[model samples]
Target: ERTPVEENGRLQVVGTALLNQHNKPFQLRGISTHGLQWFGQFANKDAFQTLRDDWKANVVRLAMYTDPNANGYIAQPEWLKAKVKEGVQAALDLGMYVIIDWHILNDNDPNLYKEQAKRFFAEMAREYGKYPNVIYEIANEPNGNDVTWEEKIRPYADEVIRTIRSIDRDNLIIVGTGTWSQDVDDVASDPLPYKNIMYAVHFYSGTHTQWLRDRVDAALQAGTPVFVSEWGTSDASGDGGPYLEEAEKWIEFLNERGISWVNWSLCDKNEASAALRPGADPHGGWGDDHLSDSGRFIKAKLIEALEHHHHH
Candidate 1:
């Protein structure tokens, strides 16, 4: 009946689930931007308005990568920080939830840029802590074989969570697990003791199937709250077939569990996972012609979920 922020107020992690201010289990469905350095234009207010009104997305993820290539946060801190602020301001204006993703992919381990992350999240929490629509994803995908959860990921998360908690005590914070965030079950064994913390589980439908879902089940059964901060219809490489069937199954699973999710991504980078077609407008107001197969599929599913919620 009201805007998402007006209705949800603030979000919390409650016993293996994310709950809204109403204390009802809530799911945040949305789209993630490709690296802001490349696709930052689409994270503007106009495109976010389109996602909120047309694509039925209630959230938007600003993937502020930390890698050096293409001038990520490490290379151009001011520019990337502006980009994140733009996305957050746009989502807040539209009454949609926004994720400030400290995207760490090529960096492999979150501790690699621990000092930078602390400063970044500390500033973000200080500024946006009062906003009901803001959610902090401290780590995007902490990977590498040597990067164990206890040794690397958890320590980094503990510090970041502590940093954020110091500024904002209640906003939901998501931590990416080991192995590109596929180790939710592993984190469930020794999750952080802080409240309002959720673990991220990313997947590419074609590359991950029943085994991944089984891991999700294991994590849920262990009473660990899971959030799919990023998933794609394509394979792991972000290319190849738009595995619609596999993606549909994942959608069902997420919906059945009321687990929140954000699809990757909202770019036109000539990939199977790119939601927009090449040369599509950076602003909003795109038509079906501007959409890729993945875009069509994800848009339809978002609308379906929106309508389903409206009915009940």
Candidate 2:
């Protein structure tokens, strides 16, 4: 097995896929952690060991919520940053790729708090710039009528990308698309000018269908490099029930295109997308009964993908 020394290197976008420092196509398949306010316990070595050693995950995304009232940047930026660092450390300790997700769920309009995002990313980029393991996701899901490719999204990205570049230029940066990060078509028409950047597309199998795939196809045809920072087998609400058939189809589509993905979450919250059941151990090593339906399906799919790619 390769260590982080080899896995965590300066990444690039080639055609429509991600390439490692060796310039070889690479797909990072792994789990995205829920907000630290809720599932902070799992962002450590033991849980990361479970992911890297057992589940064969090659990447991890730390979804730090950005709502003003949530345990996020506006509320307690410093604490959340530390929690994010813990997860990044975990990924680096195991030689895995890590995404610092600036989750913008309810605050759909990214421009509303653009300056704060700049500060957060600026600090993060400087602190983690030396490690190729870091990938900054500026927006989790940009939304609203004004949040278009040219309006709010691009300019905000320009600012954050500038902040990151001034301190750390080489590590990759990802910006979110409009309409909840599903409007890759819009982004493809007028993509960003920065280098080592990709557009973020999020989906929930139960809600997003072939039309979404069609949009992704348009982006690919237009030479847009895409990265699915977040997705799940349930509906967009982050709950409901598992949509295995649709989820499988999406997974196959991603595999066929060599697109990297992180399953919605690694939490025990009794939600359809949460990969564990309530009271399940947060440090991993979960048994079958410890997993929910979505959790079980995601686990099997992760393991299958790992073995399929011979990543394990």
Candidate 3:
């Protein structure tokens, strides 16, 4: 009963940590579903209630993918946008922060879908900008054909960031880095001037190690704010052993720096990162029998810190 049951609405960044209205550091520990197209039901109000009330979740990330997302944003723009909006409204109703992730994987250079991204974000910003519970993720992960931080991803972020800022300036924004959000060092070198911006650095415990940690260390040293928006306990492919032993190191590293994260993901798919079982309830309220080892592990860690932090 440490964390207040009453929603501590709207979150902001202070120094390196995310802070609530009380100016106390707040860490978001929640689940990011596979893709809204497939997992929309699990992200609705009923599911969010289970996450917030039973699982003690504080945030939810809506992965509105661009291409290769099975009738995703590119093909069904209005439908995907509506789904994202639905999740955001649901999160707000539950008193939890929401991340509208513009998932970019198949299309490496976000510029490939530039105009669409701009229009999409412009509308989203206009609608959700005024709310404190919303957070914008301009691009999911910029990687492909030797994309560089300065030339490709940085410029792409600049444009999207500009578009979002034009409409909304108060909410926190997270931009992805190069090499699948692991190249924070480069982002730190050439960062956006705007305030309330945090660069992303994703990792899969089974693949990334101290070498990746070195990159993160360098970014933090250079005063580049970071948010581990998406990460996993499996390999980069999102299918591998739980890698709990290696994941422990990642858990330690993130806590040491007070970096906030939303683990990937919350689905019943037969994958290492699915978290839930194939037949788990579409509207959540799951038990251990319904969760994968990764699911239980993440749930435990999240509640552990959340329970511990709120007691203070």
Candidate 4:
């Protein structure tokens, strides 16, 4: 049986549309579980459930593959299928939303993933689409090799969305803009072909500021819902420089507008900006030479920011 999802007049998750209760629009705040790529093997289903229950997170983003077309569609890769199901089921069990992300890198034919995209969304929509727990993010940060909005990115995204809607009619579909999903202003002004769509943007606190605020505001004002699906802070000295102060300000701006957002990840493993680290103090001063420590501190600070802006 499919789970029951409350639908406002405008944001009902009927079939594939996310209409609002009053027929207006609404957004959801969430966190991306990219760390699942690292820990899914050992963690049981409870791992995902714990995040939803403890973190007050309403959404989880799961990436399928770097390139669905070149590498065969592996949404159900033997190694990760069971865990993926468990994670999706766990989130559904908790009444949280899940975004099946086609996290591709570099510029490729969006049509390359169409067959797989249709199959993936059809299966997911058949299984969990009835519940309001599933969303389809067509692609991650699409860039590389002179892929501009008109020539490459937009058309590719349009094809993916076309494929998805052909199967799942009412579920929310998120499409990322170009320049690593940071170009919302251009997207807002462009004549996109899809409906029931939301624009997905990423903010690396280390590189963005209120300058992005203008773009976001423009999107929202133009009737486009913004989703900040990835963001983090790092000391300015290292790669990407420090933009935490600016990031915090942007977070504040997002909160005030009730725009939904998700931190890049939940846990830091040995990876560069993961949430946890080995032999590092989870609650102590960060060392100057400790890049991991700096990342950890930033994660903690992001959590703090979320706590402060809890109303949204």
Candidate 5:
């Protein structure tokens, strides 16, 4: 009857691996909710319970976008912050780990909202810093051709990380790389100067194959901790073939290396990456008929890994 937090306690980074309280390497398997603006209803307590008890997920990511067009954090800060707190509480109630993802996409440059991010994380760190289950992902994906790791991403991460560390000294923090988090190699050469820091790498298995994995391998070889914060079985567009074969290949790669990952995502939108079918219940209690092919695959993988851990 022990939960992940109860068993693992606080998480930390040792070399390039994530170690639990016992100093043993640990991997977090879970699903991310789609843009909270569109899918906030599905991030309730029941949904998290279903993920924990039924699908065997141990972590859940709250992806709150920062762009205004999506009515995200910029347009409605209080409303969005309330949702984040709600989701965080739900995960805590179930004793599962949670990621407070500062989802930056259309903004392209995290500096566009740097002050807001500072304020947001400052408040969040003050509130949730004491909890062992919380992990702060300062920036989601720093994209665009102009956004280089050193100039744009690293500077932004340095400031935001300082802001968080000033208040919360020990909770794990995840920093994103350039080019939508594909440039792990760039981060490896000159990584952040902080303890318990992990770099984020995202990929859609159909689009990013062996080449991306090779980049990640190099980063790990260079002693940089990598976390697959978001990935899809489909192409990069979030709609296409639920490429099970390619996804399985990536799964084997992640498992062999002890890299933690969270699938994208746990919504009912009409997309291949969505775990639920359209019109599926926004809460929990999803049956096979209510799940999409990707959902079934992810659930099976989670359960399979859970069974394997029990054997230990």
Candidate 6:
């Protein structure tokens, strides 16, 4: 379980201890459920172990390949490689944390998963890269018109983060920041060389406003280490627009800064991109309302109001 060592230059996370590895100050309180394309068509291991033992939720963003225009090709075939290895061995046999997303769209081609991101991180760094629960999100929301944030998605996400650091140096690898991922202020003014390489974005508070708290306070005053991997609250009568007061003010500016999020879906009857149905529309609506106002109250009271102020 050693291997992920780069320190000061990044890539840590093998067993923590390096200033807690990229400020993972721990405040996730997560929940972004989606059966990795229906793990074997709803092989619902007791609903994925009831989202990790009765909604405790450590992490589970699954969604490996959501059609990137087949054959212009991004990869992940072979029946999505046995349903992403049975959804990363069923979320590492239920210990949790398994983000693995390549869900592209809008003619995606961040080097189309760069040679299957070096054969899917060399067979997922030879099986779960020593399992810290794994987290690798290359692309998800890259919009159209030949998307270009530095000519074609940052040189194809800097060659798939240098091909997953030539074979998993250690977990944690999320890099999305184009138009759909709502350009994290151009990925915090053009940052992404690779270290603990964490900088993903996605908001849907009625298509972003409140100036996203000054673009997340200018990427936390340039220290840059944001995660909000995905956000939601759609319901313009089922299209996405409740914006629960702008998603409770962007979840209270990500619980005042100890940012780390993962809530775009947890299957409220799967409506494709952002589901969550029960009565729908609580606000503007289209298809992405974070959830509330008595619509689709999936137990845990909206995951206890998103882990009760997340980090506040």
Candidate 5 regions off by >4 Å? Answer: none
Candidate 6, residues 107-199, lDDT tens digits: the string is 455565567656765676677677666778878678765675676777777787777777676667777767776666666557666766666
lDDT of 2 at 211: 88
Candidate 2 per-residue lDDT, tens place, 3-32, comes to 644754788876677888898778888889
Clashing pairs in 5: none
lDDT of 2 at 1: 77
Off by over 4 Å in 4: 1-26, 35-37, 41-44, 68-76, 107-112, 235-243, 279-312
Q: Could you tell me the lDDT of residue 34 within candidate 4?
A: 51
Question: Model 5: per-residue lDDT, tens digit, 1-312?
Answer: 688899898999988989999988789999999999899898889999999989999999999999998889999999999999999999888999999999999898999999999999999999989899999998899999999998899999999999999999999999988899898889866888898999999999779999999989988998988999999998999999989899998988998898999999999999999999999988899999999999999999899888877786
Better of 3 and 5 by lDDT: 5
Off by over 4 Å in 1: none
Model 1 lDDT tens row, 91-140: 88899999999999999999989999999999999999999899999989
For each candidate in turn, the TM-score is: 0.98, 0.96, 0.94, 0.75, 0.99, 0.29
Give the range where candidate 6 is weakest over 10 consecutive residues by summed lDDT.
1-10
Question: What does the lDDT read for residue 159 in candidate 4?
Answer: 71
lDDT of 3 at 233: 88
Question: Candidate 6: misplaced stretches above 4 Å?
Answer: 1-50, 55-93, 100-128, 131-133, 138-147, 150-152, 163-165, 169-177, 180-205, 208-229, 234-312
In candidate 2, clashing pairs total 1
How big is the positional error of residue 28 in model 3, measured in Å on the Cα after superposition? 1.5
Model 3: per-residue lDDT, tens digit, 65-128?
8885466789888888888888988887777788999998878888888889899889988987
**Model 3 segments more than 4 A misplaced:** 1-7, 68-70
Better of 3 and 6 by lDDT: 3
Model 2 stretches with alpha carbons more than 4 Å out: 4-8
The CA-based lDDT of model 3 is what? 0.83
Each model's lDDT comes to 0.92, 0.86, 0.83, 0.58, 0.92, 0.58
